[PDB]
Design a protein around this ligand. Sequence first.
Ligand SMILES: Nc1ncnc2c1ncn2[C@@H]1O[C@H](COP(=O)(O)OP(=O)(O)OP(=O)(O)O)[C@@H](O)[C@H]1O
Ligand SMILES: [Mg+2]
Ligand SMILES: [Zn+2]
Lengths: 187, 286, 94, 51, 53, 131, 272
Amino acid sequence: ALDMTTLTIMRYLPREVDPLVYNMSHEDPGNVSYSEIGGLSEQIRELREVIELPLTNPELFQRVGIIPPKGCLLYGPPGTGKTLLARAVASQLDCNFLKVVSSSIVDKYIGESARLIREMFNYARDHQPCIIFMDEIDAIGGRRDREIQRTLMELLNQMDGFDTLHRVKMIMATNRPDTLDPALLRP
Amino acid sequence: AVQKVVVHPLVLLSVVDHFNRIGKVGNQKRVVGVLLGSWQKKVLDVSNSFAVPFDEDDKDDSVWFLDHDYLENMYGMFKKVNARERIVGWYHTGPKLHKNDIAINELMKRYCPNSVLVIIDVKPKDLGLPTEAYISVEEVHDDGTPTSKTFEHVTSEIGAEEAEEVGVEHLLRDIKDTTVGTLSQRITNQVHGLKGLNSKLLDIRSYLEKVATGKLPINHQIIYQLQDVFNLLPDVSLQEFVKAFYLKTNDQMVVVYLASLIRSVVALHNLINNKIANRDAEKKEG
Amino acid sequence: TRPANHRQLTFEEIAKSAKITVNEVELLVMKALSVGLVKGSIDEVDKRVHMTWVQPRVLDLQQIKGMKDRLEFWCTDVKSMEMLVEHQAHDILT
Amino acid sequence: IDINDVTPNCRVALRNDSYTLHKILPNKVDPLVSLMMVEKVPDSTYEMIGG
Amino acid sequence: ENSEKIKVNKTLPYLVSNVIELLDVKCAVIKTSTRQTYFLPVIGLVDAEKLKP
Amino acid sequence: EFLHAQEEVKRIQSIPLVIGQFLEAVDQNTAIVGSTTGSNYYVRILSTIDRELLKPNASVALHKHSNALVDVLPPLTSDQKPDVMYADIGGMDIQKQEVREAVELPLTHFELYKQIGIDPPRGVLMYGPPG
Amino acid sequence: AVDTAEQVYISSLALLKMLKHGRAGVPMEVMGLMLGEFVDDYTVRVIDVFAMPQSGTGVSVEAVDPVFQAKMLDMLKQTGRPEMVVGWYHSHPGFGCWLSGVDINTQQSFEALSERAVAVVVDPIQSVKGKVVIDAFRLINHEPRQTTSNLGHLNKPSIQALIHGLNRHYYSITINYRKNELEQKMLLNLHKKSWMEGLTLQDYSEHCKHNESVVKEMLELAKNYNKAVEEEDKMTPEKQDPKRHLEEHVDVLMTSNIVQCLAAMLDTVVFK
Ligand SMILES: Nc1ncnc2c1ncn2[C@@H]1O[C@H](COP(=O)(O)OP(=O)(O)OP(=O)(O)O)[C@@H](O)[C@H]1O
Ligand SMILES: [Mg+2]
Ligand SMILES: [Zn+2]
C-alpha cells in the first residue's frame, strides 16, 4: 500500500484474492458422495488416486520419489457425470476447492484473462491444499480469438510452474476433447 | 514504561510562540500547555500542542490554576480538526521543576493514564536538546529508601514529519549549513563534540562535588552506573590493539596518499594546459 | 580498586586476596562468570586473567571522592585536547 | 513563429500548459514498420558476386 | 450533533466500486470503477459483516 | 553556496520519482521521454547524469510533477527454461558429447568461430526412435 | 486609499501549521484561518494559524462554521492571543497556487468582511524537497494597484495562475517570512548534530568497504582519463566523465579518510 502524497510504502498487504477467485472457491458444490455417483468405479478410483491420494497422503509420494501427476482431464459424452464426479470430489474432501466455467474467465479487457488465471493459481498456491476444477476447458484449450491463445499460453506457463511440493491439483472437463490443442495433451 | 518520546517542530514552535505571547505582557517564570500525540509500540510521537490558561503562586507552590473546561473543549475541537491526536503529556517552559508540578501531572493523568511532562527551555539556545521529558513514578525503590511520588527521566529527541521538515528547512535555508561540509563542518563537529564531552564531564564533576560534600542526596543508583561507565573505558595502548590501530591508520594513510597524488597530477595537468593556452594567445597576438 | 589501568589481574594477588591456593582461583573466576556478575576471560599459560566488568555496585563517600579525583584527571585531559585541537586547526575551524 | 518550417509530422513539442507550440525537435523516422521487411540500403556489392 | 456532522459529510457523488478481501491489521480493499486499487485503513460508515468481495 | 546548490541538485532527484522510458535526445540539456503513465514529454535532462548511460531504450526516473528526467536506472518468456541438467540425463554420453560440441560451444564461444569466418553453426539434426 | 506593491509577513508557526494541515488534508482540499494584524497599508502580518473542521461541502464559505470560529477565537483570546482574524488559507494538492472560481467568491466574502483580508493557497504535495509552493492573493474591484516602489517585481508570476487569473481577477502579493533569532536555532536543533554524533567513529568494516569501492572507481576513471589525455591533439575543439569525476572522487575519499583517522585518533588519546 502506498501513500497518496509521497507514495512511500506502508502496510504491505499479504496478497489479493481477486474476488472472482473468492466466488469460485466459496461456491456450493453439493453434498454429493461417491455413493451417489455410480457406474464409474474404475474412473472414481483413478481420479481419487490422481487427485485425492497425492493431496491427503503425500509422504508416500515424496519418500518413494514419484512426482504426483499435476492434473487430470475428463472427457466423454454429455451427461456422463464428469461434472458430477468433480462435484463429489469437491464435496467429500475437506479442502479448498476452485471451480470456474472456462467461458467466464475470458474478459473483454486487454490481457485481463491472463492476470485472472495467474491470480487463480497464486491463490491456489497460497491456500493449499487447494483444488482447481476446469469445466468446458475447450473454451480456451482449443486448437490455435487472439486473447484465447494469449491466455492459453499463460495457462501452459502457469501450470508448468507447479513445483513438486505444492498440494494443488487440476481437473479439466470437456465434451469435445478433439478440439483441445495438443499442447495440453503433452506429458 | 515509556522508552522514548519524539517531539516535532510544531509543538516547540507553538510553545515558543506561547512564551513570547505571555512574556510580552504577563512575564512569568513559566507557561503551561498540553501536548497531543500518538503511540507506536511503546514510543510516543508528539505533534500538536495548545496553550491553556494557567497560573502559579510565587512561593506557596501549592496554589495553581489549570483550566479544566478550557482543556476539555480545546481538546474536543482539536479532535474535530484532527482526531488522531489524543492528549499525551503537558509542556512547560520553566527551566526548573517545582514542588507544584506533580499536582499538575496528577491532574493531567485524569486525561491520560501515563501523561508525560516536557520542559522546553525556550530561553536557552545552547549545547543541545532543548526538550526534557519526565514520567510519573511511584514504587518502593527496592532498596529500603522511602517511596515518594517522583518524576523520572525518559529520553527525548526531535523528529519531523515530512511537511514539517520542508517547512523548517525553508526557514533555516539562509542560516543553513550544508549537510556534507567536507572538512570544515566535520572538524568543527569534532571540536564541538570535545566541547560537549568536557561540559558533561564537568557536570558529573559538580554532581560528585555536591555528593561528597553532602548537600545532595546519594542516589546510589546512577552513581554505580557511573562507576560502570568508569570501568567501561577501553584502555588503549594494549599491544594487539596498538598493532590493529597502526594497521588501519596506515591503510587510511595509503588511501589519502593515492588521493593526494592524483590531486597533484590533475593540478599539474591544469597548470600545463593553462600555460599552453596563454602562450598560444600571446604568440597569436604578435 | 582500579579504573582498568591495571585490570590484567595477576593470579597471585587475587589468590592472596582470597587467601586460597593458586589452584582454586580458576574455579573462583569461573563461578563469578557463571553467575553473570563478571565478564572477564582467563589465561592459564601465564596464569594472568583478562578481566572485564559489567556489574556495578555500591559506593561510599570515600569512593565518591576517589571517583571525583580520577574523573578530574580525565576531564582535564579532555579540556587539554579541546584547546589543543582548537589552536592547531584555527584557520580551518573558524 | 516560423510556421513554414512546420511541415506535417515534424514531432514538434508543445508547452505543458496552454500548449502554445514550443519548438520543432528532431524528426520521427525509426521506420520499424518498414524495417520488418525492408532491407534499407543493403550490403551486397558486385565484388563478392563472381561468375 | 455527531450524526449531523456525518450527514453533511455523506454527499454525492459516491464513485461506485467493487470490494476485495478484508484484512485485520476489519479493513477493506477497493477496486474503483476508474480501474484503480485503494486500501482503506478503516472500512468506513458501513460494517464489515454486511459487505463481502 | 556551491555546496548548497549541489545539495539542492541532489535533492531534486530524490524519491519519489516516476519511471519512464528514454527516447532519443534533442540537445545536451534536454531529450524526449515517454512516461510509464503512457504519455510522452519533451523534458530537460539533469546535467549531473552521465550521458553515456542514455541508451535509447533506458529506463529513467523523472520528477513526479515537472517530469524532469533526473535519474537513470541500472537495467524468460515461459517455462522455456526447463530446469534439467546433464545429471538427469540417462547417460547418453556419446550423444552428450556430439550435441555439446554441436551447440554448447557455439552458444558459448561463437565469436571464436566467427574469427574463423565460417558463419558459426545454424543447424543440427536430432534423429532416433520417438522417445 | 488604493493599495500598493504591499507585503505579507507570515510567521514560522503559521507556516508550519499551514503545511501540516495541508499534508493532513491531501487529497481532499482543506482550509482554515490565520490570525494577524493589519499593521499598515503596505504590509499585513499574520501570526498563528488555526485549521477548522473539514465539512463535506469542500472549501467554501459554508465550510466556515460560525460557532467553531467564534468559540475558537474566544478561547484563543483567553489563552493570550487576541489577534483579530484576517486571511484564510486553503490547500490545492496536485495543482499550482491559484484561486479557483469558488475561491474568488470566498475571498470576495472575506474582503467584504474586513476589507483587506488576504487569500492563501498552499499545495502540500508540491511543497516538498525543500521548496514550498505558497502564494497569497487579493481580488480587484484600469489600474490594478499602485506601483510606487520596486519591491513588486523582485518576483515573477507563474503561467498556471496566469491563465487562472494571477493578474486577471486577482493579484498575487509577495510573501515574506518573519522568523526571529529565537525561532532560529530553536528549529535548528532538529538537524543539530549531537556531540556523540560528532565523536562517532562510523564503522571500520563499512569504511573499508567504502574505500575499496571508491579506489576501484578511481581506477576505472583514470583508465579513460589516460585516453582523454592521449587524445590531446585538438581535433574539432569541443564536462562529462574523467576530470571532474576524478575530482569529486578524490575529494570525498580524502575527506572521509581524514575525518575517520582524526576521529579515531581523538578517541584514542582523549578517551583514556
Ligand atoms: N453415473 C452416474 N450416476 C449418477 N448420476 C449420474 C451419472 N452420470 C450422470 N449422472 C447425472 O446426470 C447429470 C449429468 O450432469 P453433469 O454436468 O455431471 O454431466 P457431464 O457428463 O459431466 O457433463 P459436462 O462435462 O457437460 O458438464 C447429473 O444430474 C448427474 O447427477
Ligand atoms: Mg462438465
Ligand atoms: Zn480553492
